[PDB]
Amino acid sequence: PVDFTGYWKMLVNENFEEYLRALDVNVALRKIANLLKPDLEIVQDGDHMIIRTLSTFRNYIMDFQVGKEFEEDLTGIDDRKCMTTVSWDGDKLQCVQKGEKEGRGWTLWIEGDELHLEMRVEGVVCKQVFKKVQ
């Protein structure tokens, strides 16, 4: 497939407020969150991945095996638990987060030297794009 390993800096963040609102994140947390420009630090070995969303407020750590369902604790975000599976879809990663909210998930992929992340919940789409510092 592809190796996502890298320290990726955020260039684009569209519709993040609407995504967090769909997760019932409170006004307070949303206001601060929208100002953050979280980086993604990814380390990967084959089907094992650690994806760290890094900000000056809180970090969120995902540590999983592609293809293998796990209990995802979304502490710090909406503090929900999901039954989550990240799967290969050709060269993209597709994440389905089963739980309270319908259609909750995300898609991660590389186009050239850009890392694209699309986050989804209840028909709301947030678009993020990242690049490494060369």
Ligand X SMILES: CC1=C(/C=C/C(C)=C/C=C/C(C)=C\CO)C(C)(C)CCC1
Residues near Na ion (CB under 5 A), total:
1
How many Å apart are CA 17 and CA 40, to the nearest integer?
19
In the list 4, 7, 60, 70, the residue contacting ligand X (rule: CB under 6 A) is 60
Q: Categorise residue 38: left if φ over 0, alpha if ψ from -120 to 50, beta otherwise.
A: beta
CB of residue 38 to Na ion, shortest distance in Å: 17
Our finding on whether 55 is near ligand X (CB under 6 A) is: yes
In the list 21, 58, 92, 127, the residue contacting ligand X (rule: CB under 6 A) is 58
Q: Indicate the Cα dihedral angle 74, 78, 79, 82, nearest 10°.
A: -50
- CB closer to Na ion out of 22 and 42: 22
Our finding on whether 76 is near ligand X (CB under 6 A) is: yes
Enter the tokens of residue 17.
Answer: 């407020």
Instruction: Lay out the site mask for ligand X across 96-125 (x = CB under 6 A, - = otherwise).
Output: ----------x------------x------
The contacts found for 50-58 with CB under 8 angstroms, 24 or more apart, are: 51/4, 57/32, 57/33
**Which residues make up the interface to ligand X (CB under 6 A)?**
20, 25, 33, 36, 38, 51, 53, 55, 57-58, 60, 62, 76-77, 106, 119
